[PDB]
Every structure is written in C-alpha cells, then in structure tokens.
Symmetry: D3
Subunit: 248 residues, 6 copies
Amino acid sequence: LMQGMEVQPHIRLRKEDVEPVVIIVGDPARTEEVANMCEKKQELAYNREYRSFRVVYDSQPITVISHGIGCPGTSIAIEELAYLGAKVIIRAGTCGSLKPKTLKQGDVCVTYAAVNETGLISNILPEGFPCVATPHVYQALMDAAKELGIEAASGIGVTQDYFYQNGILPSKLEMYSKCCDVIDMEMSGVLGLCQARGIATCGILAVDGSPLQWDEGDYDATGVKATTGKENMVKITLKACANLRRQY
Amino acid sequence: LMQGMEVQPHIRLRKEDVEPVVIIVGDPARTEEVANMCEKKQELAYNREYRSFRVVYDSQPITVISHGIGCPGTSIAIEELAYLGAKVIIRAGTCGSLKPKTLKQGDVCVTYAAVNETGLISNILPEGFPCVATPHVYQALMDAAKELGIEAASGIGVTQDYFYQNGILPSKLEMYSKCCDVIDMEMSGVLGLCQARGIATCGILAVDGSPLQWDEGDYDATGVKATTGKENMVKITLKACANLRRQY
Amino acid sequence: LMQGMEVQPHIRLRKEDVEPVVIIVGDPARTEEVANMCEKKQELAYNREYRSFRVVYDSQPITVISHGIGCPGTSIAIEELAYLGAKVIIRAGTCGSLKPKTLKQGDVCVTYAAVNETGLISNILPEGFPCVATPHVYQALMDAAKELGIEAASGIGVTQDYFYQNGILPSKLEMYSKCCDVIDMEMSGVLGLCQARGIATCGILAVDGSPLQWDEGDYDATGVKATTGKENMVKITLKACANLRRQY
Amino acid sequence: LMQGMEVQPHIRLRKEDVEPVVIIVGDPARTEEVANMCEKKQELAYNREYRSFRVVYDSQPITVISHGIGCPGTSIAIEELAYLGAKVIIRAGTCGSLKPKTLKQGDVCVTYAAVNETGLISNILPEGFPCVATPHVYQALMDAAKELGIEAASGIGVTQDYFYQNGILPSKLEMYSKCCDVIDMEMSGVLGLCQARGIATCGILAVDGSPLQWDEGDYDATGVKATTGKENMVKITLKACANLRRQY
Amino acid sequence: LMQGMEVQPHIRLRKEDVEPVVIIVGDPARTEEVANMCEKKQELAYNREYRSFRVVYDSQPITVISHGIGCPGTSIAIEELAYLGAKVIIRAGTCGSLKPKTLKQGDVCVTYAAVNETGLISNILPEGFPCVATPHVYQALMDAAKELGIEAASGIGVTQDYFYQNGILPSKLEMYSKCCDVIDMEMSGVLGLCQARGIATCGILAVDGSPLQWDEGDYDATGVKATTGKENMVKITLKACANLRRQY
Amino acid sequence: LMQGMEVQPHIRLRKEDVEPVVIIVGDPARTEEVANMCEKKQELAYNREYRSFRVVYDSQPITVISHGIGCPGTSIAIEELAYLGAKVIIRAGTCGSLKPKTLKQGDVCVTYAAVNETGLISNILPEGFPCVATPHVYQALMDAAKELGIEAASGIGVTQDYFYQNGILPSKLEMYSKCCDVIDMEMSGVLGLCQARGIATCGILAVDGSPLQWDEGDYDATGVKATTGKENMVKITLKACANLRRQY
Ligand SMILES: O=c1[nH]cnc2c([C@@H]3N[C@H](CO)[C@@H](O)[C@H]3O)c[nH]c12
Ligand SMILES: O=c1[nH]cnc2c([C@@H]3N[C@H](CO)[C@@H](O)[C@H]3O)c[nH]c12
Ligand SMILES: O=c1[nH]cnc2c([C@@H]3N[C@H](CO)[C@@H](O)[C@H]3O)c[nH]c12
Ligand SMILES: O=c1[nH]cnc2c([C@@H]3N[C@H](CO)[C@@H](O)[C@H]3O)c[nH]c12
Ligand SMILES: O=c1[nH]cnc2c([C@@H]3N[C@H](CO)[C@@H](O)[C@H]3O)c[nH]c12
Ligand SMILES: O=c1[nH]cnc2c([C@@H]3N[C@H](CO)[C@@H](O)[C@H]3O)c[nH]c12
C-alpha cells in the first residue's frame, strides 16, 4: 500500500499551505515584492526556484509562489499546487512587446491566449489545443484594472522555450508580430496545463523591452518604466485575486 | 491598372450590403429562421451555399449569411465579408456533445476557444496559434443569455474536417472528450481566421447529439430538443449582436 | 437494437435515389445545368448545399449531386452516397491554372492525381497516401474526350483548404507550380476518400483563372471562356458516366 | 568555365549508352535475366550496384539497369539516367503482398501509385505529393498483359525505407493493409522522383511473400512461384517498353 | 552606436567572473555543495534561479552555477556563459532510471547523448540533430571515475519538458525504456545547445528513482542513496574539470 | 513449427561466416581493397550489392561486407549481420565536406554522430533519437589514427536519402554547414540502427569533394587525393578492428 508525500517534493508545501487562489511569478524575488503590498505575509518555503508565501489582501488569503524561467520548471509547480488543491492560477510575469509602436516598457497586457511554441504543450495536449484563459478570470483582471484606473491592454501572446534569438535557424519573431502582441517563455504552458488540469487561469504581463528592437537597445528590465509596470500589474492581480478568493 | 470587383464573387454582395456585425450559420435554411425573428428582413443574395439577409433587430441592422459545412467554404465567406467591411463575426451553429452526462440535445454552448484539427488553420497560421474568441464578444453572448434567463454553457470545442468517424485510422474523439466539451466542423477556422483578419469573434453552438453515442442513437438534428436549442441560441445571438452593432 | 435512417441526414436521399455512378459538382446550380443536357431529369432533394437529381443520358440513369466548396462538406456527401450504394464518383469542378502559358480560361484538365494540402486526408489516411484516380475511370473520361474531339489536358492538381492567398505565412503557389498543373479545393479529398472507401474515382476540371496572375486580373468564372470550358467538361463527363453506368 | 562529366559518376554511362526508355530493377542479377529474353544484348557497365545493358526487344533498343535496394541508391540512378536523356522509366521489381487472400507468391501487380513512407520523397517534394504512375505508361503495361494473356492485378503499393519489422515502435503493416495491396522499398521514390523530373513512369511488381505472414513462413524469393512471377512480369515489361520505345 | 552590458542580465556575471570550464547544476543548493568540496570558494552572484561560485579544485579555477529546472531557463544560463567566455560546460544533475534492474538510486551515469523531446532543441536546431557529448569531455569524466574507483555507467538519456506523467495523452516512458537508460529535463538541451555554440560538453547524472516504478514508491531524492550518488558524481566532475581547466 | 533460414536471404551468409567485428563499406569493390591490405582473405558471398569476405589482420578475423548506397539497403545488411552475431559494426565510407576550408579531398573524419534526415531512422526510432557512436569504438579509431600518425578529424556529419541537390524544394546544405562537418547517405542510419540493436558502432569517412562547391568542380572520387584518403581510412579501421576483435 502506498501513501502520499507529507510535503510535495519540489515546492515543499503541504495542503494547509496552499490557498484555492494562487499567484505565480517567474522570479523568486517578486514573491516578496507582492507580499510587501499586502496587509499580512508569511513565507512558507524556498526550495530550488520555488519560493512561496501566504499573503492576505483585502482580508483574503492568497498563495504566492515563484515558478522559475520556462514551462518545464513551471509544470512542476502547477502539478504540485494542483495536487494540493489550487483552483485558480494567475501568472503575473514580464514579457517583450511585439508591437513596439503601442506596447512599450512599463505597459501591462492581460493575455487571454498565447501561441504555443513549447515542448511541454506539444507533448501533453493534442495538436491544435488552444492555450487560452478562463473567461471569468480574464474578466476579474480587466475589472480590477478598470476600477483602479490602470490602463491594461488585452492581447494574445506567443511563448517560446528560449530567450535569445541566435541563429542556425531563422528567427520567427517577425512572423509572430503579425498575429500577436507580446512574447514570453511560460504563458502558453501555464494556460494550457491549467486548462488540462481544470484550473481556472489567466495571465498578465509587464513589458520590459521589444526583442524586435533589442539591437537598438530596447530592453530595460530593472529601469523605472519596467518597475512601475510590474507594480501596476501586481496591484491589478492582487485586487482580482481577493475577489476570486471570496468565491471559495 | 486594376480595380476591385463590384460584387464579391462567391457571396455576391457589395459593401452597402454588409453591416459591421455579421451572424454566420452553416445552413442556408437557418438564415431565414433568424430573419423571421426580426422586426424587418431583406434577402440580399443566394449563390452556391451563401444565402444572405439584412435583418433589423432591436432597431439595429445586422447581416446574416450561411457559410456551408466546413472551414474551406467558410474561409471564402469570411474573407469576402472582411473585404466588404465586417468588423464582428459570430458563428451560430450546431455541434455534437463530448460531455453526454452534462451537455445534451437542446443545450447551448458558447465556445470561447476550439481545438484545431483543420487544414485551413494549420496552413494559414503558425503552429500553436490559439483559435480563441474575442473576450468582449464572448461577454456579449453570455450577458445576453443571462438577461434572457437562458442557460448557456461556456466551453472549449474541437473542430474537425470531417463528420463521420469511419476508420482506417483510430478515432480521436475519446481523447478529445478529456479536454473538450463539444465538436463541430467550422469553429476553430472561424475563430482563428477572424483573429488573423482582426475581426472580433465568438461562437455559440446548439447540441444535436453526441458522437461518442451515435452507435446508441444519440442524434436528432430535426427533433424538438435540437429545434428549441437552436431557437434559444438565435435569441441570445440576436440580442448580443444588436448590442454590439450599436457601438459602430 | 438499432436501425438505419430512412433518408441520409445531410443529402436527404434513400438508397432507391442513388445510382452506382454519381457525378459530383461543387455548385448546386451546376446540378441543373448537367440535368438540362440529358434526355430525362428528376430533382430528388435539396438540403443545405446538397442538391440532387437523377438524370438519364444515353439511356443510362446517373446521379448528379452538389457537394459544396471544400473537402469537409464534400466528405459528408461522399460518405452518405457510399452508404447508399455509390460505386463510381467523378468530380466535375472548376479550378485555377498553375501553368498560365498552356492552361488558360476555358481549358479542361482531367486530374489523375492531386497533391494533398487538406486536413481531411491528413487525418483520415496515413501520411504519404496518394490521392489518385482509378485508372479505368480516368480512361473513360479521356476516351470520351477523344471521341468528342474535345481537347483535354491530363494533369496532377493541388488541393488546398482555402481560396484566397492572404499572408501571415508565405504562399506556396509558386512552389506548387513547379510540380503540378491546376489548383482547387476538393480534388485530393474526393480521390483520397473514394480510394479509402473502395469507390472508383477521377476528377475533371475547367479552368476559371490563374491565381499566380489574379493580381493582373486573370479570373473570370462567369465569362464565356469559363462557361464553354464547363460545358465541354460536362459533355465529356456525361459520355464517360453512361459508359461506366452500363457495367452495373 | 565548367564542363559536364564524360561518364556519369555512379552508373558510369555516357549519353550514347542510354535509350529514351529504361527498365530499372533492384538486383544486378536481374538485368542479365531480362537481357537473356531479348533478340540482342550488350553489357555496358557495372559499377557499385549499377549494372547496365542495352537490349533489343521486338527490334526496339531499351536500356536495362539495376538500382539497388532502397530509394537513395535508386535516386542516383534516376538522376544520372535523366541527365543522360531517359524519358520513360519503369521499375520491374519484387514486393510483399498485403492482401494474402488474393495476391500470393508468383502473382504480378501493376502499381499505379504508392503510399510514401520514404525520406527521399518527404524531403524533395512538398508534403502530400502523390507518388503516381503516368497513365499512358500504366496503360501500356496493362495492355501488354492483356495481349499476353497474363493476369496482372492493378493496385496501390506502400514503400518503406526498411525491410524487417523488428520493433521499438509498432509495425504499421496492419494499417497499410487496409488501404494498400503490396509493399516494397523503392516504388514511391521511383514514381515520385520521375514525376518531379518529368519522366513518364510506372511500376510492376512480382510477389515473393506476405510480411503479415512471415511468422508462418510466407516468403520464398527463390522458389518456383516467385521465379515464374518475375518471368511473367519481365514479359509484360519488355512488350510494353518496345511499344513505348517506338514513339521516340 | 550600441555597447554590451556590463553584467549579463540573468546570471549577473561579468567576463572576469567566468572561467573557461563551467559546471552547471539544476539546484542553487548544489552549487554550495560543490564549492564545499574545493580548496577555495567565492560566491559571485545569485539572481533568480542562477547562483554562481568560483571554486578552486586541484589548483584549478572553475565556475559553478545553477541553471534551474528545464531547458528554457538553462538556455539563458548557457547563452550568457558563452558570451562571457565559457569553453567547456558539464551538467552534473539528477535523473530517473529507465533501467530499474541495473541502474538504481545512488548510481551514476555519464550520458554521452540524449533523446530530445524538448521544444528548445526542436526549434533552434534542424530536425534530427544529435544531442551528443564532446568525446574528449566524456573521456575526462570516465577517466576521472576510473581513477577514483567509482563505478559510472555510460549511457543515452532522454530529456522531456515535464516531470509528472499525468495523462490526457499516453506516457512514452515504456517506449523510451527500450532505447534509453535514464530520464531528465535538461540534458538534450545542454548537449545540443553547447554543440551549436561550439562549447565542449558532456553530462553526468545521479539516479534518484525510477519513474516506471514511481507507483511503487521508487523515488527518494533526499535519501542516503541519492545523496551519496550525487557526492560521487561531484567527485568525478571536479576531478575531470580540473584536468580540462589546465588546457586553457 | 518454424525454423531459421540456413543462409540469411540478402547477404547470403550463415553464422559461421560472420565475426563479432564487422567493417561495412558502401561499394562492393572496396571489400576487396580492404581484403588486399590483410594477411589472409576469403571471399564468402556476393549477392545483390552485398559482397562479403573474412579477413585476417594482426592475427584477428574480421568480417568485411558492402551495404550499397543508402540507409534502406544498409538496414538489411545490418539486421542480417546482427541476427548472425555481429557485435561491432564500423562504417568506413566516403563523404562530402561541409567545411571546405579545413576538410578537403583526401582528408579523413571520424564521425561520432550524425544529423538524421533519413526515413529509416525517422520511422524506426522515436523523434529526437541521437544517431551517435559508441564511445569506446570512437576511441579505438582515434587511438589507431594517433598510433599510425595519420591525421583524423573528429566531427558530426549529416545523412540524407539523396545525393543530387535538384530543387522543387530549397537545398538545406547551407544550413547544415553551420552545425556539422561532413555529409553522406548512410551514417545516421548505421549509428542509429546499431544503437537500437545493441551493436557497438562508429563511422569513419574519407572526403571526395564538397557539395557546397560542386558548381566549381570540387569533386574527384577517383583521384589520387580521394584514393589516398580511403587508403588511410582503411589503415585506421583495420588497426582499430583487430584491437576490438581481441576482446571477443
Ligand atoms: O523579451 C522577452 N522575450 C522572452 N521572454 C521574456 C520575459 C520573461 N521574463 C523571463 C526572461 O527574462 C522569462 O520568464 C520570460 O517569460 C521578459 N521579457 C521577455
Ligand atoms: O456531432 C457533430 N460532429 C461534427 N459536426 C457537427 C455539427 C455541425 N453541423 C454540420 C454537420 O451537421 C457541420 O457544420 C458541423 O459543424 C453538428 N453536429 C456535429
Ligand atoms: O483558382 C482557384 N483556386 C482554388 N480553387 C478554385 C476553384 C474551385 N471552385 C470553387 C471556388 O470558386 C472551389 O470549389 C474550388 O475547388 C476554381 N478556381 C479556383
Ligand atoms: O515483403 C517485402 N517487403 C518489402 N520489400 C520487399 C521486396 C523488394 N525487394 C528488395 C528486398 O528483397 C527491395 O528492393 C524491396 O523493394 C520484395 N519483397 C518485399
Ligand atoms: O525521474 C525523473 N524524471 C525527470 N527528471 C528528473 C530529475 C531532474 N531533476 C529535476 C527534477 O527533480 C530536473 O532538473 C530533472 O532534470 C531527477 N529525476 C528525474
Ligand atoms: O558529397 C556527398 N554527398 C552525399 N553522399 C556522399 C558520399 C557517399 N558515397 C556514396 C555516394 O557516392 C554514398 O554512399 C554516400 O554515402 C560521398 N560523397 C558524398
């Protein structure tokens, strides 16, 4: 006879450590930044790239945890969170703009879908599966942005299993720019895997540059524009998550 | 020097015949059924499988046109409608249920996305492109349903380039049923192509059977359950479309 | 215990309405044009894009039915016709030329094979399956053309799930032109599915333009050249079909 | 400034050594067997797996050359033959039966098409390209068979890049048997490459066993049944080739 | 005019911080464990999942840095390390056994190649590219193992973009077990990307369980067997890396 | 009840004719060239493209057999050799250079891996399988070259199912040149299939030209440079094989 593990092996959490609403972010440092915007915080665990907190925002307890860069490491956090009872997962991340005329450093984009280029989604779901947000979760993010008076684009992203565009094979970014708005490394994986696991999901992203213009120096992840965009994104996410959390 | 054609060659419409909001249906016969629910109707053209009306619902003029069975015939209608000024396209169709316990003949499902198995989308858009609805169009359909007090599921469909499941190669329906709610032959093509052409889009579908249970006689497209489901779908679609039409 | 349907659900025919030899055409209007070239005609049904006649040519009864634009809608007609006892199916359609120097508006091409770009054939048959005509059916068409003194090219076509060549992704027509003669939207589906169902098959197509030269206005489906080509194609098809019909 | 080579590097022939009609066979030994059925024979070259003769049959000069097992070695022979002026290429080979009830050791099958599973065709031609015979070449083979009173099946083959079916991955033969009659290792490559190079082409194959029943000993390449089948195939091929040769 | 960044944006290192020989490990915690086995250690940076040290082993300075779980996060580390002058990269990681009879918890396997199932390698290199070790780097690891008297298997791994095998689509592990010895989430990406960037490379892996037997509790990443295996792996890696470092 | 064949059907050998170490070459003529460098030789069989010898070099008996051009014909020899007890198979072949600056006619390259473009490996092994040499076999070849004072490059090759680069579709050689060293038509098939069958394997190739420069006449397979390269390759292979043979 077999038994479950006391603590999930990678995120090192037990079921009492996980709320039905979870905010996931790529960078362990951002979990603390989120926590510092809340009334109460408690750091739970920090193993590998997975740092977790319970936070209280608008009297609602929410889980905040880092997933690391890329779909594979993210798949582990999502599977372990799902086993522990997560019901809503929102990725609050950073991204490049593929529309440098209208989405610029500091801007926020709520991604209701993402073009999949990841090996994760290509192997765990049938070909042609849409990596799409749950409508009421997208609506909670947009309604939060509206209430706060914070501008938020609504867009389709593209997700790749790499950052740098160094070529044996031709870059696809020019083509992608003709049908989507932003680019990152986890979104289609998050949306797709959450849909597959019956977890309600959406993404929101703050722009740090444009890879179409990296050659002209359009990148500044640490700068004031990016820092302010991320702050705005977190304000929207926390508002939306307290509203969702109430339903559980 | 070249000039545009006076009437588009397949749908046989001119720009003055096309409203910015369009309802598309598979069957020529359904265009008249829609039109009979309106204050005013005018049949415009009927060429090949493309029968078109201008209708007035809640004082708003809306185009209604049939697209025929399958993505290819549908692609022609959408391309020619787009050239003529269509800004919003909603497919109001029929479908099979892949969730026979909960979605049955007569039920309506608003499809915010669809798994693509079509050659159309596989060839005109990059691999991994999400065939997804425009959020505000989905919201208009759901809000119309709520207002009318008509139950409408929210789901992900799958779209195939065939109807019958006679096999040399194994049927994929059991697998699709694990991650999809409904099945049809145009939705991913509509959503995907409209996204590509910058047309706001969504789908709504009335269930006529369950292909997982066709072998036990779970199909009745002409029956009272399916007929009532389609009537409900049309009520929701017309209400949502009048609201959308007002913004133009 | 289950029973068959009295009338097939889409084409709305019973087995007594279907001959072992069937001519299929994309446009419902062409079924009547064919019928008007015969000694006797009887319209049978008209549902959705499927209009059907029994015709008598050279004392032989033949079925004539429209299949609509594209492989998906066509697959339904072919499956339902096959269930009702069809043994020979010939598509008499229209097409673009990929050899604008030697195949021009008004010319006829008997297609003994087609390059498949359809989602239908890609999903129902193994990769690499040849969408090819049955030799004795091709021979009947060619022998009819010879007897009538009507010039008919012999060629390989390409079949796509779309008409317009509007690009996120590069058009493939230039490449296709280096290995085939004509382009349409149903041929590989017809040939492939018929082969799969053990139905003897071939295609014949009348040229209405060249998509390589659409930008220079090389398209005229309603014009005298195209109209005459279609008339010639129908004369060949009817002669060949009466000969085949005799064998049953 | 560059010049052509005097003799082609693999087959080691000059243009005066090559007739416009060529019979290709897999085994060097079969070139002599063919030549022994003719009025006159002259061995030309033998390099690697490529052994060549000029033969005279019914007063017509024809090239006979071996291509070796598999599409890659065969591609070299065809390319070099084409450079030297070949206009018609017919493969007279051996094969397995996928229809063991009706096609048995000693039987002959004229293959007007073949399912492609070769890397050759997958890489040199677009996906979905039909590996198909030239109708008038198929007709010459069938007419020769009819004249000789030798039974010849007409069928579709499948071509693979291997012979043995030892598995890490599942064998596909049972599936192929639903839609194909025979199996070999060169046919789709011959038909496809000849089509691409504008060479008129067809295949004819003598059955030596059934791989579906190899486990029960259904294989005898050297036996009297197979030897007689190959003799019959050669009789048909030589007769058809003399007729074709006359047109040049 | 553009300039390079002073510190690379993700790993936060400058060229003077990077040695030509680099050991990469998945877990930030393992960088310290490696460093504790050396004569001298200096922690350099810790940003996101990227923690780095300079270590001195057998008088040779070597970089040690964590890459996080999965190819995408790893690609960033390798690209930025390569820009900074890395010439040799060895992944010292953990893995599952696909050969549970012979490779068990605590065992070490030097992987000279890996089956690629990653989106990274599928998109940055041509199809069929071998994710393979540089022979002299493999030899340095094996020679170090032989010198130390520590048993090390030599094998081929498989790399996937996920850890958990929860299925909508069938698990491929049983098939992989026929042709692979171990399974992890980064190896094919490391080997393949290093080959592409002209970095000499190999992998070594300590077994922590067998996913074929996870259902029977064959997993213990923190246990004494796995801990000893990792210690042995590190001993081999440090010895091989000092030898390699000397050549620069 | 079934029995094995006395003599394998294609190579026409019995188990007593096959040594555990086998040298395979594409050209039947090269088997004799190899044999003439040995103390003792015995020709065993010659059927189709498969000519075989037992040779004695440095008192060790080794099998030498031709496999013909291309993976398919080669797969037969390898399967039949494996059934007869072959344990080590080394391909000693010829190749084109993709690095015309540093690998030129007459140069030798030991290929420890090959990019797969063959239909053989694509169908018998999972996607992403590395076609890689067995490390100790590569080491035996390199150690032989070092001992003999013969320069030998160490490289990754690419293997295609064709020789000539004649285009419907764009040539891939320019891209391949950015990630590998040499090009041939059997290597990935040999390495991959041997790995699959548990046979230890490596490849060594002598350069006869550069296909990137065929247009400038960079090809001379019969010339003194190529002839000397092949002689050098054979000297290395025979030395390495006698060493390996001793272990059995
Ligand atoms: O321009 C970009 N391209 C790809 N990914 C990202 C990101 C996101 N942040 C991380 C990379 O810095 C990674 O998690 C990715 O999802 C920000 N900007 C870009
Ligand atoms: O059970 C089903 N499977 C696939 N398509 C459909 C449909 C839709 N209606 C048409 C086929 O009846 C076609 O347009 C398809 O999209 C209704 N039910 C089903
Ligand atoms: O130039 C062309 N490209 C693609 N299809 C067609 C057709 C055929 N006629 C219909 C489109 O008008 C459709 O059934 C297609 O098969 C005529 N011309 C062309
Ligand atoms: O049962 C079979 N399977 C696959 N190929 C062949 C052949 C043909 N003959 C050669 C293999 O014996 C090869 O050229 C292949 O095309 C005969 N029988 C069979
Ligand atoms: O059984 C396994 N399957 C897949 N990956 C891993 C690993 C490796 N360690 C991390 C997951 O624990 C990840 O980096 C992966 O590469 C250890 N064991 C296994
Ligand atoms: O430049 C080349 N391209 C492809 N193959 C080869 C060869 C090898 N020799 C044979 C072709 O001559 C074939 O077996 C192939 O593997 C030599 N040179 C080249």
